[PDB]
Amino acid sequence: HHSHMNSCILQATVVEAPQLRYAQDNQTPVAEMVVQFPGLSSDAPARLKVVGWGAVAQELQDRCRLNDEVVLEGRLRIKQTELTVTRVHH
């Protein structure tokens, strides 16, 4: 559990297909992909690295394909920025 509020919910398009690997413990699945979402003005769109661990990692690899529009819920992490996903709506 985390002590601080860090709720980031984004509607985005999958632009780099999810790749899966097992973490150091050779037991926890970890999936990473890249998504793109609109700038606040038309601002170039933004691209963000998205990472999921465990069950959500398997769901990302299983469901997310290039050009799919999804909603992601996760915590912002940061120098490289990334969204550590908790849930995804396909």
Residue ranges binding its own copies (CB under 8 A): 1-12, 37-40, 43-44, 46-48, 55, 69, 71, 73, 75-79, 81, 84, 87, 89
Find tokens 């979402």 and name the residue: 37
Do 54 and 61 form a contact (C-beta atoms < 8 A)?
A: no
Task: Give the residue with the Cβ less far from its own copies, 26 or 78.
Answer: 78
CB of 23 to its own copies, least distance (A): 13
CB within 8 Å of 54: residues ≥ 6 apart: 28, 29
CB of 58 to its own copies, least distance (A): 14
